[PDB]
């Protein structure tokens, strides 16, 4: 993330972090249940084989409650393709259940119609991660959060060089130096309604990070709720 | 209005049926006796920041 704040303890407990063979964080994830993690499909090409870390809040000091889980099954969207970043979604089912604690608590899946009229109509949502701290910058050590206004789809489309499919949406800022960045990809964009935080997007892509006149592009989750449901029932 | 006004006062999901408002709740919540508020079925419900 570029800009924003740092997540006080227990305020971003649905954050997961995928870690490679070198036990190093390269993509985010979102905890959906004791057993399921939500992520971006393209993060699967950024590592040969990986694991998931919950409750981490700083890479140097062990805060007690961190814990790492093996992935049992990967359900990658069939129609994801590398050249367009369409369908940038995948779900992981673990070999072991994450046990909820202080700082690991799942984020909510909504019901599609209500989310689309009530969640996607809110002014902003909340993105988070350990990803780089500036556009050509270094990966962050401590976990950070960011409030990103929803950017309407028309203005979005006009700001970008590439196609913005309906399985994507815009959030962030025109000129202001705040955005997600590489290493945050796959992690959570949640929208709050009456003090509950529902998964509304996956960090997917963007033109640079914080670029002036460019926003962040997220997998539109509601467009994939049914597919997510079916993955949990197969 | 119905779902337009305070979400039909549902806490979470609001859906229209029978030209009236029908609340639901997310998994790990159950809908209260009053048909709108949502009660946690467990100690770590989804979408809730952890406190001490």
């Amino acid at each position, epitope marked *: 993330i570029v800009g924003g704040q740092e997540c006080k303890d227990g305020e971003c407990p649905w954050q997961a972090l995928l870690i490679n063979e070198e036990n190093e964080g390269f993509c985010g994830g979102t905890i959906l249940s004791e057993f399921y993690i939500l992520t971006a499909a393209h993060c699967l090409y950024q590592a040969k084989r990986f694991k998931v870390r919950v409750g981490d809040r700083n890479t140097e000091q062990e805060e007690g409650g961190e814990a790492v889980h093996e992935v049992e099954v990967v359900i990658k969207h069939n129609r994801f393709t590398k050249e367009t970043y369409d369908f940038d979604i995948a779900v992981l089912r673990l070999k072991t*259940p994450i046990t909820f604690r202080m700082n690991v608590a799942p984020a909510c899946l909504p019901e599609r119609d209500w989310a689309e009229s009530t969640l996607m109509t809110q002014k902003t949502g909340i993105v988070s991660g350990f990803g780089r701290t500036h556009e050509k910058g270094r990966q962050s050590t401590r976990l950070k959060m960011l409030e990103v206004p929803y950017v309407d789809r028309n203005s979005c489309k006009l700001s970008s060089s590439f196609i913005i499919t309906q399985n994507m949406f815009c959030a962030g800022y025109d000129t202001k130096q705040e955005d997600a960045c590489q290493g945050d990809s796959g992690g959570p964009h949640v929208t709050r309604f009456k003090d509950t935080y529902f998964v509304t997007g996956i960090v997917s892509w963007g033109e640079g990070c914080a670029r002036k006149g460019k926003y962040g592009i997220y997998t539109k989750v509601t467009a994939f709720l049914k597919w997510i449901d079916r993955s949990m029932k197969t | 209005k119905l779902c337009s006004l305070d979400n039909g006062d549902c806490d979470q999901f609001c859906h229209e049926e029978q030209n009236s408002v*029908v609340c639901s709740c997310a*998994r790990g919540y159950t809908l209260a006796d009053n048909g709108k508020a949502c009660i946690p079925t467990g100690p770590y419900p989804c979408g809730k920041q952890t406190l001490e």
Partner: antibody
Framework: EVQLVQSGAEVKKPGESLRISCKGS????????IVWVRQMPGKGLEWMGM????????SYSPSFQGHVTISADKSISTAYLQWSSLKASDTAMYYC?????????????WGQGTLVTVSS | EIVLTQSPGTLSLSPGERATLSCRAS???????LAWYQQKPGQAPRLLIY???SRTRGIPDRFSGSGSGTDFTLTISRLEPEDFAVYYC??????????FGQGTKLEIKR
């Protein structure tokens, strides 16, 4: 009040077809899978299959596939269980029950049951 | 597919006592945790408790569940006249769908 209400007891002969119904009220029917459950007389519960009423997607128990049909009519919030050709062994109580969506593994609301009798 | 074997077939107890019902599952390559149901004569099954630690609304805190892997139990701390019935465990695996135990009859020891 959310309810599942099933149609009443049926009495049929082998070889006849039959359709029983299961009506949801007090919630959006489309938003939950609807499962059917068998209970042979004096016996235990048997899961038969389920349907997603939003798109009528169905999944049958292998033990029951080809012997029964699950269907739905979302305009009237009703699910159905149908046999083209009954056997005496279909004599049992049949329940409908709601299966939530993303991560449910259990049935929160049950219909009152439908008694099915198959006999010459 | 996971076959669930509950035990005992019939449990004979007195009002006031604590009850323990077993269910053992083939913890396959997946598995997880189980849901449990109560059923009284002439009534539909009723969901009591489920998942790692969820409870249906209205279930008194005398009802609790535990176990993991292949071994699970449900415990009732203090039996009420209204508590005597058949109990079913129920599993799901993602690839494996749903299965039930064979039931335990909770009867009054007199």
């Amino acid at each position: 009040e959310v309810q599942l209400v099933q149609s009443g007891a049926e009495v049929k002969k082998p070889g006849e077809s039959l359709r029983i119904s299961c009506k949801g009220s007090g919630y959006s029917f489309s938003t939950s899978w609807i499962v059917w459950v068998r209970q042979m007389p004096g016996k235990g519960l048997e899961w038969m299959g389920m349907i997603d009423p939003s798109d009528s997607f169905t999944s049958y128990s292998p033990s029951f596939q080809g012997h029964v049909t699950i269907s739905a009519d979302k305009s009237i919030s009703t699910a159905y269980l149908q046999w083209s050709s009954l056997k005496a062994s279909d004599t049992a109580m049949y329940y409908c029950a709601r299966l939530h969506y993303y991560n449910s593994e259990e049935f929160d609301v049950w219909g009152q049951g439908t008694l099915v009798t198959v006999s010459s | 597919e996971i076959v669930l074997t509950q035990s005992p077939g019939t449990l004979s107890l007195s009002p006031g006592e604590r009850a323990t019902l077993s269910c053992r599952a083939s913890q396959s390559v997946s598995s997880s945790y189980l849901a449990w149901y109560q059923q009284k004569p002439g009534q539909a099954p009723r969901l009591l408790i489920y998942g790692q630690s969820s409870r249906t609304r209205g279930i008194p805190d005398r009802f609790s569940g535990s176990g993991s892997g292949t071994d699970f139990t449900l415990t009732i701390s203090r039996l009420e006249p209204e508590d005597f019935a058949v109990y079913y465990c129920q599993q799901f695996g993602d690839s494996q769908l749903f299965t039930f135990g064979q039931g335990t009859k909770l009867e009054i020891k007199r």
